[PDB]
Design an enzyme around this catalytic site. Structure first.
Site: not given
Ligand SMILES: C=C1C[C@@]23CC[C@H]4[C@@](C)(CCC[C@@]4(C)C(=O)O[C@@H]4O[C@H](CO)[C@@H](O)[C@H](O)[C@H]4O)[C@@H]2CC[C@]1(O[C@@H]1O[C@H](CO)[C@@H](O)[C@H](O)[C@H]1O)C3
Ligand code: NA
Length: 403
Positions: A14, A113
């Site tokens: 991520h 995200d």
């Protein structure tokens, strides 16, 4: 003039893509603030052109947020806690930054995200537009939205509820950036894009001297790296070692200190391991290694960004699952993209050795390398001025100004 705020999830597959996105946008003339937990804080001197601001777990963490393994599957319990509790603090930090804004600058948008679904109503409350980054594949989205693994997920209550929340807050966003390129997943495009009203933009984010590598013949080295969050039991570490030996290939094995539970680094290795074949290191820059002509294959975690970085350099793979990972994703790479081999039986020396030989030595494995090299060419063309990724990026940059 225009600042973007980026808020990544603080785990291997991520952080890197969000930082790369930060770099792209910096190069298109945006200033950059990164919001990040203190947990797994990246190295800020490596990104001197970004402002970092640590939030959500400052000094007195207090509770279970203070407990919680730093490694393996349960580390990620930080994520549901922040989705559940983080709104007011995310709101406060956003307000503090807007209050300190210089007269000649404004904040264009927040990019989070997709896992940070709580951030949407916070952004909405401040009249700030939010874009989302999908750090994983279009196929992954399609598989969950619509045979055995799918029923594993239909049996998984937390997984399903989180995925429904992600989906709803992604559709509600002002835009979705996918870490991919159109030519890699051309069958998924229509279906995925269409399910989401928010406009989609496909951008493949993955796009020093190694004296020991420089002395090896081309395609002769197995590169082995399971990334920064993963861990194994001692039994599994030894089976990985037994497998490498039995492959009889030359290897560069990156082992984080702490990867083997119960030991600082590699104490469990037998005496005289390594021999003339192997090299072990604590850390190397992955993209740079993958670009080196000595590397014949890449044994990786089944994370998407790792995988994309490898095909972007033409390197075939061996895939291992960790933690709660579903076999879905390595199957897609193995059986549909056909750019590596998936280890189906956990960690076993015979299977390991076979997979290494298949990708690096065996005549009948060469299709895999070739597939990987075609993808690399397509990635190159997509990023070419005129290509689909080049144009996606240019459209995104203009769209951000129009918000
Ligand atoms: C559809 C999806 C939503 C989903 C969201 C994150 C979420 C969780 C994994 C459920 C548990 C809590 C939480 C928060 C979780 O532990 O999250 C994991 O936290 C790790 C750190 O401990 C990180 O290293 C991992 O990246 C993260 O998944 C959830 C369900 C399944 C999931 O698909 C998976 O998507 C993955 C790609 O994103 C793919 O690699 C898997 O094969 C696939 O099964 C992902
Ligand atoms: Na040696």
């Amino acid at each position: 003039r225009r600042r973007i705020i980026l808020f990544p999830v603080p785990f291997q597959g991520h952080i890197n893509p969000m930082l790369q996105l930060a770099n792209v946008l910096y190069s298109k003339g945006f200033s950059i603030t990164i919001f990040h937990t203190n947990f797994n804080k990246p190295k800020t001197s490596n990104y001197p052109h970004f402002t970092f601001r640590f939030i959500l777990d400052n000094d007195p963490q207090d509770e279970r947020i203070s407990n919680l393994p730093t490694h393996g599957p349960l580390a990620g319990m930080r994520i549901p806690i922040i989705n559940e509790h983080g709104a007011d603090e995310l709101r406060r930090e956003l307000e503090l930054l807007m209050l300190a804004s210089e007269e000649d600058e404004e904040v264009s948008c927040l990019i989070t995200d997709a896992l940070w679904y709580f951030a949407q109503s916070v952004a909405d409350s401040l009249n700030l537009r939010r874009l989302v980054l999908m750090t994983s594949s279009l196929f992954n989205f399609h598989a969950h939205v619509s045979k055995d693994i799918q029923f594993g997920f239909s049996n998984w209550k937390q997984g399903k509820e989180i995925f429904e929340n992600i989906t709803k807050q992604t559709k509600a966003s002002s835009g979705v950036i996918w870490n991919s390129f159109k030519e890699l997943e051309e069958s998924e495009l229509e279906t995925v894009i269409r399910e989401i009203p928010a406009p989609s933009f496909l951008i493949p984010l993955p796009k020093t001297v190694f004296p020991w590598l420089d002395q090896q013949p081309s395609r002769s080295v197995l590169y082995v790296s399971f990334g920064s969050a993963t861990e194994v039991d001692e039994k599994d570490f030894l089976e990985i070692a037994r497998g490498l030996v039995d492959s009889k290939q030359s290897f560069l094995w990156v082992v984080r200190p702490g990867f083997v539970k119960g030991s600082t680094w590699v104490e469990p290795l037998p005496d005289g391991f390594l021999g003339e074949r192997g090299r072990i290191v604590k850390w190397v820059p992955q993209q740079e290694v993958l670009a080196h002509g000595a590397i014949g294959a890449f044994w990786t975690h089944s994370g998407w960004n790792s995988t994309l970085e490898s095909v972007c350099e033409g390197v075939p793979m061996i895939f291992s699952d960790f933690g709660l990972d579903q076999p879905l994703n390595a199957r897609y790479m193995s059986d549909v993209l056909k750019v590596g081999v998936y280890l189906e039986n956990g960690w076993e020396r015979g299977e390991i050795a076979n997979a290494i030989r298949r990708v690096m030595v065996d005549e009948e494995g060469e299709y895999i390398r070739q597939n990987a090299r075609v993808l690399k060419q397509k990635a190159d063309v997509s990023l070419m001025k005129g290509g689909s990724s080049y144009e996606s990026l240019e459209s995104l940059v203009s769209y951000i100004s129009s918000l």
